[PDB]
Every structure is written in C-alpha cells, then in structure tokens.
Design an enzyme around this catalytic site. Structure first.
Site, PDB file in Angstrom:
ATOM      1  N   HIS A 136      65.673  23.709  49.985  1.00  0.00           N
ATOM      2  CA  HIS A 136      64.523  24.669  49.717  1.00  0.00           C
ATOM      3  C   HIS A 136      64.302  25.522  51.313  1.00  0.00           C
ATOM      4  O   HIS A 136      64.052  26.300  51.626  1.00  0.00           O
ATOM      5  CB  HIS A 136      63.528  24.343  48.831  1.00  0.00           C
ATOM      6  N   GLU A 139      68.073  18.945  45.133  1.00  0.00           N
ATOM      7  CA  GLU A 139      67.532  19.303  46.232  1.00  0.00           C
ATOM      8  C   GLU A 139      67.413  18.270  47.693  1.00  0.00           C
ATOM      9  O   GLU A 139      66.357  18.861  48.107  1.00  0.00           O
ATOM     10  CB  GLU A 139      65.420  19.351  45.782  1.00  0.00           C
ATOM     11  N   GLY A 155      53.821  21.788  54.061  1.00  0.00           N
ATOM     12  CA  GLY A 155      53.877  21.182  55.567  1.00  0.00           C
ATOM     13  C   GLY A 155      54.051  19.514  55.615  1.00  0.00           C
ATOM     14  O   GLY A 155      54.872  18.767  55.915  1.00  0.00           O
TER      15      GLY A 155
END
Ligand SMILES: O=C(N[C@@H]1CCCNC1)c1ccccc1
Length: 182
Positions: free
Chosen positions: A41, A72, A146
């Site tokens: 992503h 991913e 984050g």
C-alpha cells in the site's frame, strides 16, 4: 531493556531507512545488497525518497502467493550507492507462531520507537482494507497510523513487517527466506 530489544535495535541501526512515497513516510527494511521491503500500500513508483534523497527504483515486485492472493509485501531494488548488511540468515524458512516479539519503527513521526507486542499468532487470512491477504501475523497491541513498515523481530529472527491494525490488534506480513533467493 532486554535481549529482544537488543536484537531489534541491531536491525534498526543498520538495516532500516526512511522511505517516502506519495502515500507517506514508512519504515523500510533493507535485506541484502540494494534490496529492501515495504508494504504494498506504499504504492512504490519509479522514484522514491530514501532518508530524504531522491532515489531511482531499479526494480520492484508486489508479491502474491500461488493462489494469486495479495501478501502485502513489495520488494524494491534501490539505485543506492551502498549495500545493506545481509540479514537473510535471520529470516524464517516457514510460516510459524512466535513468542515475545518486538515491533520497531523509525520515521520523522516515530523516531527510535520499540513496542513489546508479546505473542504473535499465525493468523493466515485477513481482509486488509478490503483486500484478501494471506500469511498474516497478529499481535494484541493497538498499533496506529505511522507504524506501517515497522519491523517485527524475535531474538535472532526478523519475522515480518507491520501492514495494518483494527484498533485493538496489529497485523504484519510474514517475511520468508524464499522471498530473497538470488
Ligand atoms: O523479482 C523482481 N522483479 C521482477 C522483474 C520485474 C518486476 N517483477 C518481477 C525483483 C527482485 C528483487 C528486487 C526487486 C524486484
């Protein structure tokens, strides 16, 4: 504070860079030579910032399993003038559960961050942001925006990279030795 944090720190101090894409700043694990990993992503393009230096991407691959299911993990080869310490011998060969893991993050927002996440489950399937994803590890810590790209370690093993959370649990994509044979 203890041998877990010792191993995590040794990985952070030599095998991480700060990667910036148009989708944000990420912890990025360097594995060997100029090859690193980042969550898919992050949407790596032809140019990425590495420690705030404009860097050409020489090659990149979004990994999927042989069911053509998202993992991913994106593997990135960087046009960098310096190699990473080779840490491939710290990668597990098989899918597994773990005790007493640490999640370590280094960005502008979270410098020198280490989180003892405890027990890691081989969770397997996760609908991650609407995308069916395989080879997911789960830990019972309320991870936040984050922390994606954060490195998950046990003493002597580098086992995954943080890719999401649901407010109570955190999820990492497995790293396997077989992803980095050359
Ligand atoms: O396998 C890789 N790339 C091929 C070539 C085109 C992109 N997808 C498959 C690869 C390996 C190591 C680092 C980066 C990428």
């Amino acid at each position: 504070m203890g041998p877990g944090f010792d191993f995590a720190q040794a990985i952070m101090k030599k095998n991480t860079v700060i990667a910036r894409t148009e989708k944000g700043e990420f912890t990025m694990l360097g594995v060997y030579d100029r090859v690193a990993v980042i969550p898919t992503h992050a949407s790596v393009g032809e140019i990425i910032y590495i420690n705030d230096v404009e860097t050409r991407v020489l090659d990149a691959c979004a990994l999927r399993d042989l069911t053509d299911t998202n993992l991913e993990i994106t593997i990135v080869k960087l046009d960098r003038n310096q190699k990473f310490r080779d840490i491939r011998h710290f990668l597990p060969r098989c899918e597994d559960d773990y005790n007493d893991a640490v999640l370590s993050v280094h960005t502008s927002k979270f410098p020198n961050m280490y989180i003892p996440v405890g027990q890691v489950t081989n969770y397997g399937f996760l609908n991650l942001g609407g995308t069916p994803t395989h080879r997911i590890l789960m830990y019972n810590f309320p991870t936040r925006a984050g922390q994606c790209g954060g490195v998950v370690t046990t003493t002597g093993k580098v086992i995954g990279i943080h890719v999401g959370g649901n407010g109570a649990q955190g999820f990492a994509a497995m790293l396997l030795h077989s992803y980095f044979t050359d």
